[PDB]
Design an enzyme around this catalytic site. Structure first.
Site, PDB file in Angstrom:
ATOM      1  CG  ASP A  63      -1.756   1.280   1.304  1.00 21.07           C
ATOM      2  OD1 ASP A  63      -2.325   1.703   0.275  1.00 21.07           O
ATOM      3  OD2 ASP A  63      -1.828   1.858   2.408  1.00 21.07           O
ATOM      4  CG  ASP A 113      -2.117   7.606  -0.321  1.00 19.59           C
ATOM      5  OD1 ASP A 113      -1.421   8.643  -0.352  1.00 19.59           O
ATOM      6  OD2 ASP A 113      -2.680   7.134  -1.332  1.00 19.59           O
TER       7      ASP A 113
HETATM    8 CA    CA Z   1      -3.687   3.032   2.855  1.00 16.29          CA
END
Ligand code: CA
Ligand code: ZN
Length: 182
Positions: free
Chosen positions: A8, A10
Site C-alpha cells: 500500500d 498512502d
Molecule cells: Ca492506505
C-alpha cells in the site's frame, strides 16, 4: 518464481493527508525508504498496489497521478530502491469522471492488482507479504493467497476489523525487515 512485498501507499509509504497527488504533499514515512532498501537486499520484489479513487472522484487527474508516481519511482531508485511494479486502481462505482466510473476488479479489497503483479512477475504468493493500514489491504491479500498480512500503525487509527484480518501488526513498514528476519 520470486517472493514479493506488496505495498500500500498512502498511510504505508507516504503520510495519508487525503487524496495526495502533489509532490509538495508527498511525505515519505520515517525509515521506510531504508526498510525498502533492506527488503530488496533480502531478495524480495517490491510492488506497490494502491487504490486511487481520487481519480474517479475528480480530485485529481490520471495525468497528475502519473507525474507523482514517476517522481516517487525516481526518488526511490535514486536511493537504491528499485520497485518491481506499481499497480493502481483509478476506479470508483460512483465516479464523477465517466472514464473511471465503474465497479472494477482492481479496487482493494478485490485482489486484482495483486493477481496482475503475480502473473507479470511470477510471484510466489505464499512466500509473499502485503503491507497496508486498512481492512481492504488485508482482505485483498487473503483473496490473493498472500502468505503474510501485515497491518501498520502509520495511517488510519486501525479498526478492530482490520486487526482481525491481519497476521501481524507493526508500528511501521520501517519495522518489517527486522520482523521478517525474526
Ligand atoms: Ca492506505
Ligand atoms: Zn479498479
Amino acid at each position: 518464481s520470486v517472493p514479493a512485498i506488496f505495498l500500500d501507499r498512502d498511510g504505508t509509504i507516504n503520510v495519508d493527508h487525503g487524496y495526495v497527488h502533489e509532490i509538495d504533499n508527498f511525505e515519505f514515512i520515517d525509515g521506510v525508504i531504508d526498510a525498502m532498501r533492506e527488503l530488496k537486499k533480502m531478495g524480495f520484489a517490491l510492488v506497490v498496489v494502491t487504490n486511487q479513487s481520487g481519480i474517479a472522484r475528480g480530485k485529481f487527474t490520471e495525468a497528475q497521478f502519473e507525474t507523482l508516481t514517476e517522481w516517487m519511482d525516481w526518488s526511490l531508485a535514486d536511493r537504491d530502491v528499485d520497485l518491481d511494479g506499481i499497480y493502481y486502481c483509478p476506479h470508483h462505482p460512483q465516479g464523477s469522471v465517466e472514464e473511471f466510473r465503474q465497479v472494477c476488479d482492481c479496487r482493494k479489497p478485490h485482489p486484482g492488482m495483486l493477481l496482475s503483479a503475480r502473473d507479470y512477475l511470477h510471484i510466489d504468493m505464499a512466500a509473499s507479504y502485503m503491507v497496508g493500514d486498512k481492512l481492504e489491504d488485508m482482505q485483498a491479500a487473503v483473496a490473493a493467497n498472500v502468505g503474510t498480512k501485515v497491518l501498520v500503525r502509520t495511517g488510519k487509527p486501525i479498526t478492530p476489523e482490520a486487526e482481525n484480518a491481519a497476521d501481524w501488526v507493526l508500528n511501521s513498514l520501517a519495522d518489517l525487515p527486522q520482523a521478517i528476519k525474526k
